Structures are given as structure tokens and as C-alpha cells.
RNA sequence: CUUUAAUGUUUGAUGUUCUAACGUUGACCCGUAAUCCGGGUUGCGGACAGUGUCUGGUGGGUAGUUUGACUGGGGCGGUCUCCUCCUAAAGAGUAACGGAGGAGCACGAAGGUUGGCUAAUCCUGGUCGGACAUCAGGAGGUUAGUGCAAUGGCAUAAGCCAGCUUGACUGCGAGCGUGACGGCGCGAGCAGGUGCGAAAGCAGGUCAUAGUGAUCCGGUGGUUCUGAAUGGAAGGGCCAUC
RNA sequence: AAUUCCUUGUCGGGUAAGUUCCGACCUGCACGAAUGGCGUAAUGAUGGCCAGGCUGUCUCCACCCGAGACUCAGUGAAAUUGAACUCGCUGUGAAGAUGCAGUGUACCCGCGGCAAGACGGAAAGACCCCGUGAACCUUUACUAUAGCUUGACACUGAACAU
RNA sequence: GUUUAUUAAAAACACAGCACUGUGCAAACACGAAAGUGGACGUAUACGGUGUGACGCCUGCCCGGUGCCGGAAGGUUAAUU
RNA sequence: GUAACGGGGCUAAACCAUGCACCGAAGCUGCGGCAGCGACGCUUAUGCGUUGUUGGGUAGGGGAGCGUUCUGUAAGCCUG
RNA sequence: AGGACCGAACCGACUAAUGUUGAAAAAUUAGCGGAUGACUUGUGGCUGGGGGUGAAAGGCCAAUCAAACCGGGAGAUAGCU
RNA sequence: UUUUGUAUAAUGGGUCAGCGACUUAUAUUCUGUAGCAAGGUUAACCGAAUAGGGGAGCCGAAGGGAAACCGAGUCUUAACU
């Protein structure tokens, strides 16, 4: 039948890009599936956001035999 | 929806009570959970009754 | 005249030390079942008015 | 308070609680206003007759505000743990 | 007393009658050379009728009003909140009565944990048995599955099974995201108590993102609060919840 | 058809030629019996149609008699008006130009005439939409209410039965 | 016959006639918080309301809905107690 | 009403290519002047002197003034 | 005899032209309908504003009536010009 | 004047002269300025009447908490890293 309809935007997306000084707690990517994966020193919460575990700097890297994306944070 | 609110209440005689659903068609009988009572600080067992 | 209080709203702020003013927060009267314990939680606690609603709390509120 | 319609801040929010009527006839001394007084005795009678308190207040507290210099006799009034060291300390007595 | 009849009394119910309240828009007398009114007599009615206060029904007769917005004018039709994809110009966001769909729930397990397991589809063979049911082998390699729309995820599975279970914990919360605001979301860690595991550990619901309703008023339970002379109490507050 | 959309229905009549009229048919979009049906003599400043007479209604206007218009004398208004040294054309431009551009034309000023233009004058569009405007009107909109109606108590008593 | 005095004179209104219906007289109905009055110094061959509209020939079927009239057994039901 | 180069006219006064001249604005420079903001000074009572820079503007905000009537200064001052 | 016929007065107002800063805030001229009747008219009376009165047109109620005029609430309110 | 935009053929004005629209009161906050300063200021009223008297009050030097209450802290929670 008729359209006209949409959702409101999830405001999705990297909130902290590869060499930014995060506090932990700090959400670096806010994303629908593990579209990247938490690394060292980086947790996964219920909707798949990824946040900082300690203070440091984002580190974005391409691990393992599935060629995955991961955000890890390195000490500064 | 066809789904019912009801309480469930510590049996450790504080007046203290959780709160939750039940699709009492399916199923009947009273539900019955230990669950941490905040009054006597411990886990007792909570029974159903109406909301 | 003397300027009247927006009496509803006397009702519902409480001017703080340092010039702001303390409220209550939405969303904890009824339909509290579907609600999660962490969302109920952080509703307990009075909170602060923010900046853009400084304006009209204060023009309510001539004698706080 | 008028936003165009949209339910306004004082009508959004939830009321709270409620007044005391105790507290409308509760006063609170600073420890300068002990010297005020004509007699070296702090009571209640005392406070209002040296303007210090009103005519209605019926209870008072001594609390670490200012400072006391003179030895002073606090009668009948609550004094917080900071305002009884104060007292002490400059030679003063606190009773009931 | 077992039970039954009948004379006295109390308040009811029902009927019949009475006169004295009350009605008379029958006749007469007087005030009065007056079709008003008043007093009187008489007849007819009569505790009815009617009126006051209260109460249910009826009541456009009268009255006050309401009767939405968006919109390639308006109206008709459609739409109004929320979720997913595209439009959207490789951060976020981004419009139209642009293109497509879905939600207003479900689940005490479909939640937690420990241990295990791995689809779709095609080819070959096989009682009934067929294009397709169940069985065996090979190819295949997640195209399957995910309670439901879409998109992103998912093998260390988030998919499928079992044992034990209640972390679908209570108090909090460094730090963040997202909002004009009200709000909404993510969160390691701390305290108390718990389940599973030998242990490291994991668990503050469900692969994630819809499944919703501010305030007021009122209800129920709890409560070191308040309690209009005082002690209580009512009512109010606070916590939980409808 | 005071009713029929399709529709100037079809057929007949009348006319040289008739979307109207008269007669008929029935396929009545959507007649129909006191919301009256179908007739009906008479009546009608009532609607439709035809004919004789009659004519300047018309072909197509002519002439003539009077009241204005025109000239002189006396009196003496009006609406309107930002300011005017107030032309045509094509183009431009709040998109329909006396006023802009280009070009053309035109010696200065009246009087009688005409109405193509000055989006001419008059009236803060009556259509249309809008305003959380107004009014009056309707009803099984909402809320009240007069009136009507019901019961209870009061004014309101007695006796006797069952 | 009447009508939109001032853009509508008509097919509109009225009309005699017909029907329905109310009304027993202190009538129904109407003006009046009332008193008083109209109806009527009339009395059902009268008076009010509604429709139709001389006259001729006539006026069929439907009571489900809405409105009205009648019914009292049961169900529900106010003040009051 | 020419009316589809603005016109005249043009065989370049059109088009392409290379080059040098010039014209051209309230832009830039020159000369003179005023003000806002800085800064620094011959040297501060808060002005002046230097000097860099700025100086289109509706709604709107800010700053500085003019003039009018009336009161005091004023039985003063001006004026037959 | 007759809401009978023709037709002046009288009552009306069907058509046309003129007039439309008029002679006139509804007329003039030529024609038109009624003209013993539900006729026409003088004087006086009565009915009043959600009210009257209406052979019904929302007509009329002192030159604009789907609610008269005057004064008051009153500087109603005007998210408009 | 209104507009995205007006020589506009959109509005308004015939011309001149005089008049014609952000005021006043009481609250309240902020800026400037003046007085006094952990204080500041009085209201009615009295009055010797712009003096002086009057400190009733109001604001400020204390907050936190719904409140009891505690107090440079307090609330939250059994307790807070
Ligand atoms: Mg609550
Ligand atoms: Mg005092
Ligand atoms: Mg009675
Ligand atoms: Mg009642
Ligand atoms: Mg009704
Ligand atoms: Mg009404
Ligand atoms: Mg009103
Ligand atoms: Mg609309
Ligand atoms: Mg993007
Ligand atoms: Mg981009
Ligand atoms: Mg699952
Ligand atoms: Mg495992
Ligand atoms: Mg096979
Ligand atoms: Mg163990
Ligand atoms: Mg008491
Ligand atoms: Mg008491
Ligand atoms: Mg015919
Ligand atoms: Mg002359
Ligand atoms: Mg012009
Ligand atoms: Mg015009
Ligand atoms: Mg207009
Ligand atoms: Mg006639
Ligand atoms: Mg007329
Ligand atoms: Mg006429
Ligand atoms: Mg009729
Ligand atoms: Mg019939
Ligand atoms: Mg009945
Ligand atoms: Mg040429
Ligand atoms: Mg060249
Ligand atoms: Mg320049
Ligand atoms: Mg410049
Ligand atoms: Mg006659
Ligand atoms: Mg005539
Ligand atoms: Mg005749
Ligand atoms: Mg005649
Ligand atoms: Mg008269
Ligand atoms: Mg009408
Ligand atoms: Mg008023
Ligand atoms: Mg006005
Ligand atoms: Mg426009
Ligand atoms: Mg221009
Ligand atoms: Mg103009
Ligand atoms: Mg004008
Ligand atoms: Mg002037």
C-alpha cells in the first residue's frame, strides 16, 4: 500500500577516530552488528558499541585468518 | 497484550515485592523465583500474587 | 502590584546554592513494570534545570 | 512559561515534597552573633531581645560560622560539634 | 415445654367510612347603589387535589459551546507515534502527498552458566514412499538459522541440544554517546548477596536496533519523615507499584 | 415529465430547414397515490409552441416637428488628484510600459466629437482560502436548563375492619 | 384573494373541501415566576394542533427502523432507610 | 511596426591563431581631510601628539549629540 | 343574487423607455391588475427586542432587521492590516 | 508600505497649517553611578515636619535534605572505592 514512512537516524558511527587520547569509558564506534571488533584494552556492550578500558590512544587494526577490523586502545 | 502484570513477594515477611509479566493461559500455576531481598539484605524466595 | 508566583511551578523547582535550581525527574509516576531497575535508578535523584530552561524557570519563579 | 503548546518545563516535571512548618520557627546562630547578646548568657530570650532571632522562633542552633572571642553560656540551645569546640575553646559553657 | 387457637398492645401493609385541615372557576347574607376582594352561612368535594424541599425520567423548547492539522488552493482520499533500508553527495545530520516494508508484542525459557553440537541446496542408493517426509554416502561450505520487518552482525558462533539454575539481582557508578529541552542510550569498576564452572572466569535479561504515554488526580503496600494546644489520628512526604 | 444523466432518445405531426412545441413508444439514470395519484369546465399582468391581422422589430434606413447638445449674457457644482516638461513601435522589466533600452515620429495652444488605453472612477473582493474571528440555523454533537412527568418528606387528621 | 415597502407577483402563501389527532369545561392550548386573562360569556354539529388543498374517478402493499399509543408479570433502577 | 547584431552600418567592423598598444569602475595608486579601534609616545590628572589598521548595510544591539516646553541658578543677565 | 362582468375615482404594481453626481435615497411617461369586497381609508387605541406581528417573503417593527434604536459594561477582544 | 523581488499597471497620500502613537503606577532582575559595608536599609506612624525619631520588617554574611535533622558540610545507601 502507501509509503511516507522512515525511522529517526541512530546517530551511528566512529565517535573516536585512530590516534585520539580516550578516557576510559569512551565510546569509540557506536554500530548495529561487530562491524568492528573490541581488541585489547576495549569492551563490547549489549547493542555492540565499542568503549575505551583504560586511557590511551584509539588504535585501529586488521587481525586474524577472517581479516577482521578491530579497535584496541594503546597506552599513551 | 493477552499478557498480565503481576507481583512477586518475599517470602522473608518484609513487604518488599519484584514486579513482572505472566501468560497466565499457558501457564497457570504460580511462578516462584529466589530473588535478593534489599530489606532482610538476602536471597530468599518470592511468590506470585496480583498486581 | 506585587508580581505573582507561577505557584505550579513552586511546586516542581527549588533554587540551590549556587543560583540553580533542583527538580524531579520525569518518567517515575506509573507504567513502572516495563521499566528497567537501571532506568528507574538514575530517575531517583533530584537533578539540575538545564542552561536553555534557566530562563523560564526564573520568570516563573520572581520570588525564589 | 508559555512555549507555544508544547507541554511547558513546570507542567513536564513531577511536584515534590512538602513544607515544614517546624522549620518556619527553627533559627540558626552564628558564632558572631553570640557577643551580640547584653549578658554573656545565649538563650532564647536573649537573641530576640538583641534582634538576633525573630519573636515566633521557638528552637535555635549554634553552628561554625564567624567567630566567638568572648567566653559566652549557651542555655537551651542545640550547638553543632565545630560550634562546641568554638565555644569551648574561648572559655564558654554549654547547657541544656 | 413439644405445639395450636383466640381475646388486649406496638409499628407496618391494604381497603372502607368520617370531618375538622385544604379545594370550590355551585347558591345565599353583609360590608356595599360593587360579576374584585374579605368575613359569614350553606351545598359539593376532602386528607385526595395542589404547593414547598429533595429525587429518577423526559426535555433543540431555550442557552452556552465544540466540531483538529498536514495538503503543489480547499475539499474527497490519505496521513499524524515508533522501527529498518534507499534517496543521503565514502564522519554525523539532511526534504517531498519520494521509493519499499514493519511495530503497538512474545518468552520462567525463547533468560544465566557449564559442557557439547553445525546448516541450505544438489547428485547417487534405499519397504510402503511419489518432484518433496524418514535413512546412507558424496559434492557444498552458511547461500541455512536468528520468535517477527529490514539492515548490520553471528563459527570463539549471536545458530542448535542438555545438566544445574534465577544475574529478568539491590545499591552505586569513572567515563562517554545522543538530544533546544523533557529525555533516551552505552558503561568498566566498587559494595552487599546469588547461580553456573575444576578453574581462568561469565551473568545487572533476550544478536542488536520497534513492542510506546509526560504531568495532574486517585488506588494499594511499606516507611528513623510530617502530624495546626498536647498524645494519637486524618491528611501530606518519601520508597515500591497500579 | 417542472422528474430522463446518456439525450437534440426513437417514431409520427408541423417548417424549405424545428436542440423548443404537439402526439406516440417505455430502455422510469432517479413517477406514483392526502410527502396525495390521474383527470378536469372555468379562471390567470403565470411557463412553452403555432397561426391571421398588424407594423421601422428587421432588409436599411430617409425626411420632418419639438427638448438638450453648440454660440452669447448671468449664476455656478462634482467624483478625482504623489508630482508631471503626460507620443508610436519592438524589446526589457514584480512577468500586459507616456516615463527603462533601442528606434521612429512630432512646430506652440484651443474647440467640437469618440470611448481603444491610463490594468480609468466608486466600494480595505460578496467568489476562494486563512483566523484555535462573529452570528443565526439544525440534530439521535456535548453540557445545562424552563416545561412536563415519578417517587419520598412537609402542609396532613380521625374511626373501623381484614 | 395574499406576498419578498426598495431587482422575485409566481407554479410560492391563503382558500372552500378532506383527514388525523387532542380537548368533559376551573377544556385542551396560549400570554403570565403569580394574580389575572385569551380560548368563550363558547360546551364535542364546540374549541386547539398537524397535514392535504375545489370538483371528478380514486387513494394499493409494508409496523423491520424512527416516532407515538396501550400493557403489566419479570429484569434493571433515584431520593429515602 | 523593421523588430532573432541595441542602432547605423560592416566582406571585416565576421570567425580562428599569435602579438603589441590603448580605453575602461566609487577596485588600486597619488594629494588633502574626518572618525572608530589598537599600539607607542613630545611625554600620563585622561586629553593631546605620533603611527598601523578599519570606516556598504535591512531587522536588531551598542555609543555620542542637537533642538523644543517647563523648574532652579535668576530681585541675575538681555531688551522701547 | 354574486370574494359576478366592462370601466373612472380609490387600492395595487405586470412590461418597456427615461432617469442613475436623478425632479425623486425607488420616481416619471405610456400601457397594466382589483374596483360591493378575504375591498378601501380617516382619527384614536393595543401588542416591544430572542420580543412583537406575519394569507410565510426571514417579510415588517421610524430611509440598511437571521435579532431595532439609545446609553452603559467599554479603552470588549483583534496571534490581523 | 509590504515583499524573494516594485518605475511598477501592488498599498497610501489633492496641497498647506495645527494636532496625532512605546506612557504611567507598583513589583522584580540586570547594567551604570553614589552611600555605607559583614552588614545595608527602614514601613506605617511620631514630628522639633525634605531634619530628627521609629529597625516592625526585608535582603545578605550557610548549606544540604521531601522532612525530622545534621551543619562547612549534608544528602544518597547497610556502607560508599
Ligand atoms: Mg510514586
Ligand atoms: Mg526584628
Ligand atoms: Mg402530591
Ligand atoms: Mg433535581
Ligand atoms: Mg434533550
Ligand atoms: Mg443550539
Ligand atoms: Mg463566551
Ligand atoms: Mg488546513
Ligand atoms: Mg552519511
Ligand atoms: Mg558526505
Ligand atoms: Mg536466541
Ligand atoms: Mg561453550
Ligand atoms: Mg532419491
Ligand atoms: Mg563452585
Ligand atoms: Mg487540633
Ligand atoms: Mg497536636
Ligand atoms: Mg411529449
Ligand atoms: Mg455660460
Ligand atoms: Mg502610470
Ligand atoms: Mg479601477
Ligand atoms: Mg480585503
Ligand atoms: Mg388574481
Ligand atoms: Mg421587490
Ligand atoms: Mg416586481
Ligand atoms: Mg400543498
Ligand atoms: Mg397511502
Ligand atoms: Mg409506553
Ligand atoms: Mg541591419
Ligand atoms: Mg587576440
Ligand atoms: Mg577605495
Ligand atoms: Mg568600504
Ligand atoms: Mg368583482
Ligand atoms: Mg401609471
Ligand atoms: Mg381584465
Ligand atoms: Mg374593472
Ligand atoms: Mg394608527
Ligand atoms: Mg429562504
Ligand atoms: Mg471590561
Ligand atoms: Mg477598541
Ligand atoms: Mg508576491
Ligand atoms: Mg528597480
Ligand atoms: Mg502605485
Ligand atoms: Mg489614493
Ligand atoms: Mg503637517
New interface residues.
Given amino acids: 500500500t502507501r509509503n511516507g514512512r522512515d525511522s529517526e537516524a541512530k546517530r551511528l558511527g566512529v565517535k573516536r577516530f585512530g590516534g585520539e587520547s580516550v578516557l576510559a569509558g569512551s565510546i569509540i564506534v557506536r554500530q548495529r552488528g561487530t562491524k568492528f571488533h573490541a581488541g585489547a584494552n576495549v569492551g563490547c556492550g549489549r547493542d555492540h558499541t565499542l568503549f575505551a578500558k583504560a586511557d590511551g590512544k584509539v588504535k585501529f587494526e586488521v587481525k586474524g585468518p577472517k581479516n577482521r577490523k578491530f579497535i584496541s586502545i594503546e597506552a599513551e | 497484550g493477552i499478557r498480565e502484570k503481576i507481583k512477586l513477594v518475599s517470602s522473608a515477611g518484609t513487604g518488599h515485592f519484584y514486579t513482572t509479566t505472566k501468560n497466565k493461559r499457558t501457564k497457570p500455576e504460580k511462578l516462584e523465583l529466589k530473588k535478593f531481598d534489599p530489606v532482610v539484605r538476602q536471597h530468599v524466595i518470592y511468590k506470585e500474587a496480583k498486581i | 502590584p506585587k508580581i505573582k508566583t ?1 505557584r ?2 513552586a ?4 533554587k540551590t546554592g549556587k543560583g540553580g535550581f533542583k ?4 518518567n ?2 506509573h507504567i ?2 516495563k521499566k528497567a531497575t537501571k532506568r528507574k535508578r538514575h530517575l531517583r535523584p ?1 537533578a539540575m ?1 538545564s542552561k536553555g ?1 534557566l530562563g ?2 526564573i ?2 519563579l520572581p520570588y525564589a | 512559561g508559555f512555549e507555544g503548546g508544547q507541554m511547558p518545563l513546570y507542567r513536564r516535571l513531577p511536584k515534590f515534597g512538602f513544607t515544614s512548618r517546624k522549620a518556619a520557627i527553627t533559627a540558626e546562630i552564628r558564632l558572631s552573633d553570640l557577643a551580640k547578646v547584653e549578658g554573656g548568657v545565649v538563650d532564647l530570650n536573649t537573641l530576640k531581645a538583641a534582634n538576633i532571632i525573630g519573636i515566633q522562633i521557638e528552637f535555635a542552633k549554634v553552628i561554625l560560622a564567624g567567630e566567638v572571642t568572648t567566653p559566652v553560656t549557651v542555655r537551651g540551645l542545640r550547638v553543632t560539634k565545630g560550634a562546641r569546640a568554638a565555644i569551648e575553646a574561648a572559655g564558654g559553657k554549654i547547657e541544656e
Avoid at chain 3, 527538580?23 to 520525569?26: C, D, I, N, R, S
Fill in positions: 507561577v505550579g511551578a511546586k516542581r523547582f527549588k527538580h524531579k525527574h520525569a517515575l509516576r513502572l513494570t533530584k534545570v530552561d523560564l524557570v520568570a516563573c
